[PDB]
Design an enzyme around this catalytic site. Structure first.
Site, PDB file in Angstrom:
ATOM      1  N   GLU A  54       0.779  -1.242   0.000  1.00  0.00           N
ATOM      2  CA  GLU A  54       0.000   0.000   0.000  1.00  0.00           C
ATOM      3  C   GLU A  54       0.812   1.295   0.000  1.00  0.00           C
ATOM      4  O   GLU A  54       0.268   2.363  -0.276  1.00  0.00           O
ATOM      5  CB  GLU A  54      -0.986  -0.002   1.182  1.00  0.00           C
ATOM      6  N   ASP A  81     -11.547  -7.078  -1.911  1.00  0.00           N
ATOM      7  CA  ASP A  81     -12.442  -8.222  -1.729  1.00  0.00           C
ATOM      8  C   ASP A  81     -13.774  -7.705  -1.180  1.00  0.00           C
ATOM      9  O   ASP A  81     -13.889  -6.514  -0.877  1.00  0.00           O
ATOM     10  CB  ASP A  81     -11.833  -9.174  -0.711  1.00  0.00           C
TER      11      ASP A  81
HETATM   12  C1  LIG Z   1      -3.695  -8.559   6.234  1.00  0.00           C
HETATM   13  S1  LIG Z   1      -5.008  -7.948   7.357  1.00  0.00           S
HETATM   14  C2  LIG Z   1      -5.945  -6.940   6.143  1.00  0.00           C
HETATM   15  C3  LIG Z   1      -5.310  -5.567   5.859  1.00  0.00           C
HETATM   16  O1  LIG Z   1      -5.961  -4.954   4.676  1.00  0.00           O
HETATM   17  C4  LIG Z   1      -7.158  -4.152   5.060  1.00  0.00           C
HETATM   18  N1  LIG Z   1      -8.397  -5.054   4.642  1.00  0.00           N
HETATM   19  C5  LIG Z   1      -8.736  -5.348   3.323  1.00  0.00           C
HETATM   20  C6  LIG Z   1      -9.787  -6.142   3.203  1.00  0.00           C
HETATM   21  C7  LIG Z   1     -10.167  -6.391   4.520  1.00  0.00           C
HETATM   22  C8  LIG Z   1     -11.194  -7.179   5.103  1.00  0.00           C
HETATM   23  N2  LIG Z   1     -12.030  -7.875   4.358  1.00  0.00           N
HETATM   24  N3  LIG Z   1     -11.289  -7.201   6.491  1.00  0.00           N
HETATM   25  C9  LIG Z   1     -10.420  -6.492   7.253  1.00  0.00           C
HETATM   26  N4  LIG Z   1      -9.397  -5.719   6.802  1.00  0.00           N
HETATM   27  C10 LIG Z   1      -9.337  -5.722   5.416  1.00  0.00           C
HETATM   28  C11 LIG Z   1      -6.896  -3.912   6.604  1.00  0.00           C
HETATM   29  O2  LIG Z   1      -6.969  -2.510   6.967  1.00  0.00           O
HETATM   30  C12 LIG Z   1      -5.466  -4.550   6.974  1.00  0.00           C
HETATM   31  O3  LIG Z   1      -4.393  -3.521   6.873  1.00  0.00           O
END
Ligand SMILES: CSC[C@H]1O[C@@H](n2ccc3c(N)ncnc32)[C@H](O)[C@@H]1O
Ligand SMILES: CSC[C@H]1O[C@@H](n2ccc3c(N)ncnc32)[C@H](O)[C@@H]1O
EC number: 3.2.2.9
Lengths: 232, 234
Positions: free
Chosen positions: A12, A197
Protein backbone atom coordinates in the site's frame (compact mmCIF):
# COMPACT_ATOMS: atom_id res chain seq x y z
CA UNK A 1 1.32 22.76 3.13
CA UNK A 2 2.37 19.29 4.25
CA UNK A 3 0.18 16.28 3.48
CA UNK A 4 0.35 13.23 5.68
CA UNK A 5 -0.30 9.83 4.08
CA UNK A 6 -0.71 6.57 6.01
CA UNK A 7 -0.73 3.07 4.55
CA UNK A 8 -0.54 -0.19 6.49
CA UNK A 9 1.34 -2.64 4.25
CA UNK A 10 4.38 -2.53 1.96
CA UNK A 11 2.07 -3.03 -1.03
CA UNK A 12 0.00 0.00 0.00
CA UNK A 13 2.90 2.44 0.31
CA UNK A 14 5.53 1.23 -2.14
CA UNK A 15 4.29 3.00 -5.30
CA UNK A 16 3.95 6.34 -3.50
CA UNK A 17 7.28 5.78 -1.69
CA UNK A 18 9.00 5.23 -5.08
CA UNK A 19 7.73 8.60 -6.27
CA UNK A 20 8.79 10.75 -3.33
CA UNK A 21 11.73 13.00 -4.35
CA UNK A 22 14.25 14.63 -1.97
CA UNK A 23 13.31 11.51 -0.02
CA UNK A 24 14.51 10.84 3.49
CA UNK A 25 13.63 7.82 5.61
CA UNK A 26 12.96 7.76 9.34
CA UNK A 27 12.84 4.38 11.11
CA UNK A 28 11.16 4.81 14.49
CA UNK A 29 8.94 2.93 16.92
CA UNK A 30 8.85 0.10 14.38
CA UNK A 31 7.44 2.41 11.67
CA UNK A 32 8.85 3.96 8.55
CA UNK A 33 8.20 7.58 7.60
CA UNK A 34 9.28 8.84 4.17
CA UNK A 35 9.54 12.63 3.83
CA UNK A 36 9.97 14.65 0.66
CA UNK A 37 7.86 15.78 -2.28
CA UNK A 38 5.27 13.99 -4.38
CA UNK A 39 5.01 15.89 -7.69
CA UNK A 40 6.21 19.06 -6.00
CA UNK A 41 4.02 18.73 -2.88
CA UNK A 42 5.59 18.27 0.55
CA UNK A 43 4.37 14.96 1.99
CA UNK A 44 5.11 12.61 4.86
CA UNK A 45 4.30 9.00 4.08
CA UNK A 46 4.01 6.53 6.95
CA UNK A 47 3.96 2.73 6.65
CA UNK A 48 2.13 1.95 9.93
CA UNK A 49 1.74 -1.79 10.08
CA UNK A 50 -1.63 -3.57 10.44
CA UNK A 51 -4.21 -3.03 13.14
CA UNK A 52 -5.52 -0.31 15.40
CA UNK A 53 -2.60 0.03 17.82
CA UNK A 54 0.03 -0.08 15.04
CA UNK A 55 -1.89 2.60 13.16
CA UNK A 56 -2.44 4.74 16.30
CA UNK A 57 1.25 4.56 17.22
CA UNK A 58 2.33 5.58 13.68
CA UNK A 59 -0.26 8.36 13.34
CA UNK A 60 0.80 9.74 16.69
CA UNK A 61 4.46 9.76 15.63
CA UNK A 62 3.61 11.37 12.29
CA UNK A 63 1.52 14.13 13.83
CA UNK A 64 3.89 14.83 16.72
CA UNK A 65 7.02 14.65 14.56
CA UNK A 66 6.23 15.89 11.06
CA UNK A 67 3.09 17.89 11.88
CA UNK A 68 1.24 17.50 8.53
CA UNK A 69 -1.76 19.72 7.77
CA UNK A 70 -4.16 16.90 6.82
CA UNK A 71 -4.03 13.11 6.89
CA UNK A 72 -5.04 10.81 4.05
CA UNK A 73 -5.40 7.10 4.91
CA UNK A 74 -4.73 4.93 1.82
CA UNK A 75 -4.84 1.19 1.19
CA UNK A 76 -7.24 -1.69 0.66
CA UNK A 77 -10.59 -2.56 2.19
CA UNK A 78 -13.36 -5.17 2.25
CA UNK A 79 -16.34 -3.85 0.28
CA UNK A 80 -19.75 -3.97 1.94
CA UNK A 81 -21.82 -1.62 -0.23
CA UNK A 82 -23.83 -3.36 -3.02
CA UNK A 83 -22.35 -1.47 -5.96
CA UNK A 84 -18.71 -2.17 -4.99
CA UNK A 85 -16.51 -4.45 -7.04
CA UNK A 86 -12.81 -5.17 -6.66
CA UNK A 87 -10.75 -2.11 -7.50
CA UNK A 88 -13.50 0.37 -6.70
CA UNK A 89 -12.95 3.37 -4.39
CA UNK A 90 -14.45 4.02 -0.96
CA UNK A 91 -14.30 7.48 0.53
CA UNK A 92 -14.95 7.91 4.23
CA UNK A 93 -17.43 10.53 5.33
CA UNK A 94 -17.06 8.91 8.79
CA UNK A 95 -15.18 6.12 10.62
CA UNK A 96 -16.41 3.92 13.52
CA UNK A 97 -14.98 0.90 15.35
CA UNK A 98 -17.12 -2.13 14.56
CA UNK A 99 -15.50 -4.05 17.46
CA UNK A 100 -15.71 -1.62 20.39
CA UNK A 101 -18.38 -2.36 23.06
CA UNK A 102 -18.84 -0.39 26.25
CA UNK A 103 -22.65 -0.40 25.91
CA UNK A 104 -22.71 -1.94 29.41
CA UNK A 105 -22.23 1.69 30.51
CA UNK A 106 -24.55 3.34 28.00
CA UNK A 107 -22.14 4.32 25.22
CA UNK A 108 -23.25 3.74 21.65
CA UNK A 109 -22.11 0.44 20.15
CA UNK A 110 -18.69 1.04 18.56
CA UNK A 111 -18.07 4.15 20.68
CA UNK A 112 -15.17 4.42 23.18
CA UNK A 113 -15.59 6.62 26.29
CA UNK A 114 -14.16 10.11 25.68
CA UNK A 115 -14.76 9.92 21.92
CA UNK A 116 -17.65 10.77 19.59
CA UNK A 117 -19.54 7.61 18.55
CA UNK A 118 -18.03 8.16 15.07
CA UNK A 119 -15.22 10.33 13.70
CA UNK A 120 -16.20 12.65 10.82
CA UNK A 121 -13.90 13.05 7.83
CA UNK A 122 -13.20 16.55 6.53
CA UNK A 123 -15.73 17.94 4.07
CA UNK A 124 -13.12 19.71 1.93
CA UNK A 125 -10.94 16.59 1.78
CA UNK A 126 -14.04 14.59 0.77
CA UNK A 127 -14.97 17.16 -1.91
CA UNK A 128 -11.46 17.09 -3.35
CA UNK A 129 -11.42 13.26 -3.32
CA UNK A 130 -14.73 13.14 -5.22
CA UNK A 131 -13.61 15.72 -7.82
CA UNK A 132 -10.61 13.42 -8.52
CA UNK A 133 -12.86 10.37 -8.73
CA UNK A 134 -15.02 12.14 -11.31
CA UNK A 135 -11.96 13.30 -13.29
CA UNK A 136 -10.48 9.79 -13.41
CA UNK A 137 -13.81 8.12 -14.18
CA UNK A 138 -13.75 5.77 -11.20
CA UNK A 139 -16.63 3.94 -9.50
CA UNK A 140 -16.73 5.15 -5.89
CA UNK A 141 -19.02 5.16 -2.87
CA UNK A 142 -18.88 7.76 -0.04
CA UNK A 143 -19.94 6.72 3.45
CA UNK A 144 -19.28 4.92 6.70
CA UNK A 145 -16.11 2.83 6.95
CA UNK A 146 -15.79 0.57 10.00
CA UNK A 147 -12.55 -0.69 11.55
CA UNK A 148 -11.66 -3.60 13.80
CA UNK A 149 -8.62 -5.76 14.63
CA UNK A 150 -9.93 -8.64 12.54
CA UNK A 151 -9.84 -9.65 8.89
CA UNK A 152 -13.44 -10.11 7.80
CA UNK A 153 -14.38 -13.11 5.74
CA UNK A 154 -18.04 -13.89 6.03
CA UNK A 155 -19.67 -15.99 8.71
CA UNK A 156 -20.32 -14.53 12.18
CA UNK A 157 -17.79 -11.70 11.84
CA UNK A 158 -19.56 -10.25 8.76
CA UNK A 159 -22.96 -10.92 10.29
CA UNK A 160 -22.19 -8.84 13.35
CA UNK A 161 -20.98 -5.90 11.26
CA UNK A 162 -24.11 -6.01 9.11
CA UNK A 163 -26.26 -5.90 12.25
CA UNK A 164 -24.55 -3.04 14.03
CA UNK A 165 -23.68 -1.00 10.93
CA UNK A 166 -25.99 -1.94 8.03
CA UNK A 167 -24.96 1.30 6.30
CA UNK A 168 -21.20 0.64 6.49
CA UNK A 169 -19.77 0.73 2.96
CA UNK A 170 -16.50 -0.98 3.77
CA UNK A 171 -14.46 -2.67 6.48
CA UNK A 172 -10.78 -2.62 7.26
CA UNK A 173 -8.33 -2.39 10.21
CA UNK A 174 -6.74 1.07 10.67
CA UNK A 175 -8.95 3.94 9.48
CA UNK A 176 -10.91 4.59 12.66
CA UNK A 177 -7.70 4.41 14.77
CA UNK A 178 -6.14 7.01 12.48
CA UNK A 179 -9.35 9.11 12.66
CA UNK A 180 -9.33 8.84 16.51
CA UNK A 181 -5.72 10.08 16.70
CA UNK A 182 -6.42 12.90 14.20
CA UNK A 183 -9.49 13.80 16.25
CA UNK A 184 -7.37 14.16 19.42
CA UNK A 185 -4.88 16.45 17.65
CA UNK A 186 -7.56 18.40 15.70
CA UNK A 187 -6.22 17.25 12.34
CA UNK A 188 -8.48 16.81 9.32
CA UNK A 189 -8.46 13.40 7.68
CA UNK A 190 -10.05 11.39 4.96
CA UNK A 191 -9.90 7.75 4.08
CA UNK A 192 -9.47 6.87 0.43
CA UNK A 193 -9.23 3.12 -0.08
CA UNK A 194 -9.84 0.61 -2.89
CA UNK A 195 -11.68 -2.72 -2.70
CA UNK A 196 -9.53 -5.88 -2.58
CA UNK A 197 -12.44 -8.22 -1.73
CA UNK A 198 -16.07 -8.20 -0.50
CA UNK A 199 -15.48 -9.39 3.10
CA UNK A 200 -17.16 -12.77 2.51
CA UNK A 201 -16.07 -16.41 2.90
CA UNK A 202 -13.93 -15.91 -0.19
CA UNK A 203 -12.19 -12.68 0.91
CA UNK A 204 -8.92 -14.49 1.76
CA UNK A 205 -8.37 -15.62 -1.83
CA UNK A 206 -9.74 -12.35 -3.26
CA UNK A 207 -7.45 -10.25 -1.03
CA UNK A 208 -4.43 -12.40 -1.97
CA UNK A 209 -5.22 -11.98 -5.65
CA UNK A 210 -6.35 -8.37 -5.72
CA UNK A 211 -4.35 -6.57 -3.05
CA UNK A 212 -1.83 -5.30 -5.63
CA UNK A 213 -4.72 -4.00 -7.74
CA UNK A 214 -6.37 -2.31 -4.75
CA UNK A 215 -3.09 -0.77 -3.55
CA UNK A 216 -2.46 0.67 -7.03
CA UNK A 217 -5.93 2.18 -7.39
CA UNK A 218 -5.84 3.77 -3.96
CA UNK A 219 -2.25 5.01 -4.60
CA UNK A 220 -3.21 6.66 -7.90
CA UNK A 221 -6.22 8.30 -6.19
CA UNK A 222 -3.94 9.60 -3.39
CA UNK A 223 -1.50 10.96 -5.96
CA UNK A 224 -4.32 12.82 -7.69
CA UNK A 225 -5.77 14.00 -4.40
CA UNK A 226 -2.45 15.41 -3.21
CA UNK A 227 -2.12 17.35 -6.47
CA UNK A 228 -5.69 18.65 -6.26
CA UNK A 229 -5.28 19.88 -2.65
CA UNK A 230 -2.01 21.59 -3.55
CA UNK A 231 -3.04 23.21 -6.86
CA UNK A 232 -6.84 23.11 -7.08
CA UNK B 1 18.65 8.23 41.18
CA UNK B 2 18.71 8.72 37.41
CA UNK B 3 15.74 6.54 36.51
CA UNK B 4 12.45 7.92 35.18
CA UNK B 5 9.50 5.60 35.78
CA UNK B 6 6.53 5.89 33.41
CA UNK B 7 3.11 5.06 34.82
CA UNK B 8 -0.06 4.70 32.74
CA UNK B 9 -3.64 4.66 34.01
CA UNK B 10 -6.77 4.93 31.80
CA UNK B 11 -9.31 6.63 34.09
CA UNK B 12 -9.28 9.57 36.54
CA UNK B 13 -10.06 7.34 39.51
CA UNK B 14 -7.14 5.10 38.55
CA UNK B 15 -4.55 7.91 38.51
CA UNK B 16 -5.87 10.42 41.05
CA UNK B 17 -4.27 8.87 44.19
CA UNK B 18 -0.81 8.55 42.60
CA UNK B 19 -1.18 12.04 41.14
CA UNK B 20 -1.92 13.67 44.50
CA UNK B 21 1.31 12.15 45.80
CA UNK B 22 3.61 13.54 43.11
CA UNK B 23 6.00 16.20 44.49
CA UNK B 24 6.94 19.21 42.37
CA UNK B 25 4.11 18.07 40.13
CA UNK B 26 3.46 19.68 36.76
CA UNK B 27 0.80 18.89 34.21
CA UNK B 28 1.23 18.51 30.47
CA UNK B 29 -1.88 18.33 28.26
CA UNK B 30 -1.05 16.81 24.88
CA UNK B 31 -2.99 14.95 22.19
CA UNK B 32 -6.02 14.76 24.44
CA UNK B 33 -3.97 13.12 27.19
CA UNK B 34 -2.71 14.42 30.51
CA UNK B 35 0.80 13.69 31.79
CA UNK B 36 1.92 14.54 35.34
CA UNK B 37 5.64 14.82 36.03
CA UNK B 38 7.53 15.17 39.29
CA UNK B 39 8.67 12.76 41.97
CA UNK B 40 6.99 9.98 43.86
CA UNK B 41 8.83 9.40 47.14
CA UNK B 42 11.83 11.10 45.53
CA UNK B 43 11.82 8.99 42.35
CA UNK B 44 11.26 10.79 39.04
CA UNK B 45 7.94 9.70 37.51
CA UNK B 46 5.82 10.54 34.45
CA UNK B 47 2.17 9.56 35.03
CA UNK B 48 -0.20 9.49 32.06
CA UNK B 49 -4.00 9.40 32.14
CA UNK B 50 -4.58 7.74 28.76
CA UNK B 51 -8.30 7.44 28.29
CA UNK B 52 -10.03 4.10 27.68
CA UNK B 53 -9.32 1.50 24.99
CA UNK B 54 -6.53 0.28 22.74
CA UNK B 55 -6.11 3.32 20.58
CA UNK B 56 -6.33 5.85 23.43
CA UNK B 57 -3.72 3.84 25.35
CA UNK B 58 -1.48 3.51 22.24
CA UNK B 59 -1.67 7.23 21.51
CA UNK B 60 -0.85 8.02 25.15
CA UNK B 61 1.94 5.47 25.45
CA UNK B 62 3.50 6.74 22.21
CA UNK B 63 3.42 10.33 23.49
CA UNK B 64 4.83 9.41 26.86
CA UNK B 65 7.68 7.44 25.31
CA UNK B 66 8.52 10.05 22.69
CA UNK B 67 8.03 13.02 25.00
CA UNK B 68 9.26 11.79 28.41
CA UNK B 69 11.54 8.86 27.48
CA UNK B 70 10.81 6.86 30.64
CA UNK B 71 13.13 3.89 31.32
CA UNK B 72 10.31 1.50 32.12
CA UNK B 73 6.54 1.53 31.97
CA UNK B 74 4.10 0.35 34.60
CA UNK B 75 0.45 -0.01 33.57
CA UNK B 76 -1.85 0.52 36.58
CA UNK B 77 -5.61 0.26 37.12
CA UNK B 78 -8.50 -2.20 37.35
CA UNK B 79 -9.28 -5.45 35.57
CA UNK B 80 -11.89 -8.17 35.40
CA UNK B 81 -10.62 -11.22 37.28
CA UNK B 82 -10.56 -14.53 35.42
CA UNK B 83 -8.30 -16.81 37.51
CA UNK B 84 -10.28 -18.74 40.24
CA UNK B 85 -8.43 -17.59 43.35
CA UNK B 86 -8.92 -13.89 42.53
CA UNK B 87 -11.23 -11.82 44.69
CA UNK B 88 -12.05 -8.13 44.34
CA UNK B 89 -9.05 -6.09 45.39
CA UNK B 90 -6.44 -8.72 44.53
CA UNK B 91 -3.41 -8.01 42.36
CA UNK B 92 -2.68 -9.33 38.88
CA UNK B 93 0.80 -9.04 37.48
CA UNK B 94 1.35 -9.62 33.83
CA UNK B 95 4.03 -11.95 32.61
CA UNK B 96 2.52 -11.50 29.13
CA UNK B 97 -0.21 -9.54 27.25
CA UNK B 98 -2.29 -10.61 24.25
CA UNK B 99 -5.24 -9.03 22.40
CA UNK B 100 -8.27 -11.29 22.90
CA UNK B 101 -10.12 -9.54 20.07
CA UNK B 102 -7.57 -9.59 17.23
CA UNK B 103 -8.21 -12.12 14.51
CA UNK B 104 -6.21 -12.50 11.31
CA UNK B 105 -6.42 -16.32 11.49
CA UNK B 106 -7.77 -16.38 7.92
CA UNK B 107 -4.17 -15.66 6.92
CA UNK B 108 -2.52 -18.15 9.25
CA UNK B 109 -1.59 -15.85 12.10
CA UNK B 110 -2.11 -17.08 15.67
CA UNK B 111 -5.45 -16.06 17.18
CA UNK B 112 -4.96 -12.66 18.89
CA UNK B 113 -1.83 -11.90 16.89
CA UNK B 114 -1.55 -8.93 14.48
CA UNK B 115 0.75 -9.32 11.39
CA UNK B 116 4.14 -7.77 12.17
CA UNK B 117 3.85 -8.48 15.90
CA UNK B 118 4.72 -11.42 18.11
CA UNK B 119 1.51 -13.33 19.14
CA UNK B 120 1.98 -11.99 22.67
CA UNK B 121 4.12 -9.33 24.35
CA UNK B 122 6.31 -10.40 27.24
CA UNK B 123 6.53 -8.32 30.41
CA UNK B 124 10.00 -7.61 31.84
CA UNK B 125 11.38 -10.35 34.16
CA UNK B 126 13.03 -7.87 36.54
CA UNK B 127 9.90 -5.72 36.80
CA UNK B 128 7.84 -8.91 37.44
CA UNK B 129 10.22 -10.08 40.19
CA UNK B 130 10.17 -6.64 41.82
CA UNK B 131 6.37 -6.53 41.71
CA UNK B 132 6.17 -9.96 43.37
CA UNK B 133 8.64 -8.92 46.04
CA UNK B 134 6.33 -5.97 46.70
CA UNK B 135 3.38 -8.34 46.84
CA UNK B 136 5.08 -10.59 49.42
CA UNK B 137 6.03 -7.53 51.52
CA UNK B 138 2.49 -6.03 51.53
CA UNK B 139 1.09 -9.51 52.16
CA UNK B 140 -1.49 -9.22 49.36
CA UNK B 141 -3.12 -12.01 47.34
CA UNK B 142 -2.04 -12.02 43.72
CA UNK B 143 -1.67 -14.00 40.53
CA UNK B 144 0.97 -13.69 37.84
CA UNK B 145 0.15 -14.65 34.28
CA UNK B 146 -1.42 -13.72 30.96
CA UNK B 147 -3.50 -10.52 30.84
CA UNK B 148 -5.67 -10.12 27.72
CA UNK B 149 -7.04 -6.83 26.32
CA UNK B 150 -9.80 -5.86 23.90
CA UNK B 151 -11.97 -2.81 23.16
CA UNK B 152 -14.92 -4.28 25.07
CA UNK B 153 -16.06 -4.25 28.68
CA UNK B 154 -16.59 -7.91 29.51
CA UNK B 155 -19.92 -8.51 31.22
CA UNK B 156 -20.35 -12.28 31.23
CA UNK B 157 -22.23 -14.19 28.55
CA UNK B 158 -20.61 -14.76 25.13
CA UNK B 159 -17.92 -12.10 25.52
CA UNK B 160 -16.64 -13.93 28.58
CA UNK B 161 -17.08 -17.45 27.19
CA UNK B 162 -15.18 -16.68 24.01
CA UNK B 163 -12.25 -15.35 26.06
CA UNK B 164 -12.07 -18.36 28.38
CA UNK B 165 -12.12 -20.66 25.34
CA UNK B 166 -9.39 -18.84 23.39
CA UNK B 167 -7.17 -18.03 26.37
CA UNK B 168 -7.91 -20.66 29.10
CA UNK B 169 -4.83 -19.45 30.97
CA UNK B 170 -5.75 -15.72 31.04
CA UNK B 171 -5.90 -14.45 34.61
CA UNK B 172 -7.62 -11.13 33.88
CA UNK B 173 -9.13 -9.01 31.11
CA UNK B 174 -9.14 -5.27 30.55
CA UNK B 175 -8.80 -2.72 27.72
CA UNK B 176 -5.33 -1.09 27.57
CA UNK B 177 -2.53 -3.41 28.76
CA UNK B 178 -1.67 -5.11 25.46
CA UNK B 179 -1.78 -1.84 23.47
CA UNK B 180 0.71 -0.37 25.96
CA UNK B 181 2.86 -3.57 25.75
CA UNK B 182 2.72 -3.37 21.96
CA UNK B 183 3.94 0.27 21.90
CA UNK B 184 6.62 -0.56 24.50
CA UNK B 185 7.66 -3.58 22.48
CA UNK B 186 8.06 -1.48 19.33
CA UNK B 187 10.19 1.01 21.24
CA UNK B 188 12.11 -1.67 23.14
CA UNK B 189 10.95 -0.35 26.50
CA UNK B 190 10.52 -2.73 29.50
CA UNK B 191 6.97 -2.90 30.87
CA UNK B 192 4.86 -4.63 33.47
CA UNK B 193 1.12 -4.56 34.17
CA UNK B 194 0.15 -4.41 37.85
CA UNK B 195 -3.63 -4.00 38.12
CA UNK B 196 -6.22 -4.90 40.79
CA UNK B 197 -9.54 -6.76 40.43
CA UNK B 198 -12.73 -4.68 40.36
CA UNK B 199 -15.06 -7.48 39.17
CA UNK B 200 -15.03 -11.00 37.71
CA UNK B 201 -16.15 -10.04 34.20
CA UNK B 202 -19.55 -11.76 34.59
CA UNK B 203 -23.14 -10.52 34.27
CA UNK B 204 -22.54 -8.57 37.49
CA UNK B 205 -19.37 -6.84 36.27
CA UNK B 206 -21.18 -3.56 35.51
CA UNK B 207 -22.38 -3.19 39.11
CA UNK B 208 -19.23 -4.62 40.67
CA UNK B 209 -17.13 -2.18 38.65
CA UNK B 210 -19.18 0.85 39.79
CA UNK B 211 -18.89 -0.28 43.36
CA UNK B 212 -15.31 -1.57 43.68
CA UNK B 213 -13.39 0.51 41.15
CA UNK B 214 -12.15 2.69 44.05
CA UNK B 215 -10.95 -0.40 45.90
CA UNK B 216 -9.03 -1.73 42.88
CA UNK B 217 -7.54 1.73 42.30
CA UNK B 218 -6.42 1.95 45.92
CA UNK B 219 -4.86 -1.50 45.90
CA UNK B 220 -3.18 -1.01 42.53
CA UNK B 221 -1.87 2.45 43.49
CA UNK B 222 -0.34 1.03 46.70
CA UNK B 223 1.38 -1.64 44.61
CA UNK B 224 2.67 0.95 42.13
CA UNK B 225 4.02 3.20 44.89
CA UNK B 226 5.80 0.25 46.50
CA UNK B 227 7.04 -0.89 43.12
CA UNK B 228 8.46 2.51 42.22
CA UNK B 229 10.29 2.57 45.55
CA UNK B 230 11.46 -1.03 45.15
CA UNK B 231 12.80 -0.41 41.63
CA UNK B 232 14.79 2.66 42.65
CA UNK B 233 16.22 1.47 45.96
CA UNK B 234 15.60 -2.23 46.56
C1 LIG C 1 -3.69 -8.56 6.23
S1 LIG C 1 -5.01 -7.95 7.36
C2 LIG C 1 -5.94 -6.94 6.14
C3 LIG C 1 -5.31 -5.57 5.86
O1 LIG C 1 -5.96 -4.95 4.68
C4 LIG C 1 -7.16 -4.15 5.06
N1 LIG C 1 -8.40 -5.05 4.64
C5 LIG C 1 -8.74 -5.35 3.32
C6 LIG C 1 -9.79 -6.14 3.20
C7 LIG C 1 -10.17 -6.39 4.52
C8 LIG C 1 -11.19 -7.18 5.10
N2 LIG C 1 -12.03 -7.87 4.36
N3 LIG C 1 -11.29 -7.20 6.49
C9 LIG C 1 -10.42 -6.49 7.25
N4 LIG C 1 -9.40 -5.72 6.80
C10 LIG C 1 -9.34 -5.72 5.42
C11 LIG C 1 -6.90 -3.91 6.60
O2 LIG C 1 -6.97 -2.51 6.97
C12 LIG C 1 -5.47 -4.55 6.97
O3 LIG C 1 -4.39 -3.52 6.87
C1 LIG D 1 -15.24 1.69 31.74
S1 LIG D 1 -14.48 0.54 30.54
C2 LIG D 1 -13.49 -0.49 31.67
C3 LIG D 1 -12.15 0.14 32.04
O1 LIG D 1 -11.57 -0.54 33.20
C4 LIG D 1 -10.79 -1.72 32.81
N1 LIG D 1 -11.69 -2.99 33.15
C5 LIG D 1 -12.00 -3.41 34.44
C6 LIG D 1 -12.78 -4.48 34.48
C7 LIG D 1 -13.00 -4.79 33.15
C8 LIG D 1 -13.74 -5.81 32.48
N2 LIG D 1 -14.44 -6.75 33.14
N3 LIG D 1 -13.73 -5.80 31.09
C9 LIG D 1 -13.04 -4.86 30.43
N4 LIG D 1 -12.31 -3.86 30.96
C10 LIG D 1 -12.33 -3.89 32.32
C11 LIG D 1 -10.49 -1.41 31.30
O2 LIG D 1 -9.06 -1.53 31.00
C12 LIG D 1 -11.08 0.04 30.97
O3 LIG D 1 -10.09 1.11 31.22
Amino acid sequence: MKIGIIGAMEEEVTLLRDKIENRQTISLGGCEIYTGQLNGTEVALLKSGIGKVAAALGATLLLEHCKPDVIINTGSAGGLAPTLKVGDIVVSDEARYHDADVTAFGYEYGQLPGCPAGFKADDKLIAAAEACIAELNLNAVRGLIVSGDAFINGSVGLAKIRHNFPQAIAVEMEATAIAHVCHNFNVPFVVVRAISDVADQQSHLSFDEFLAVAAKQSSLMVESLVQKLAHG
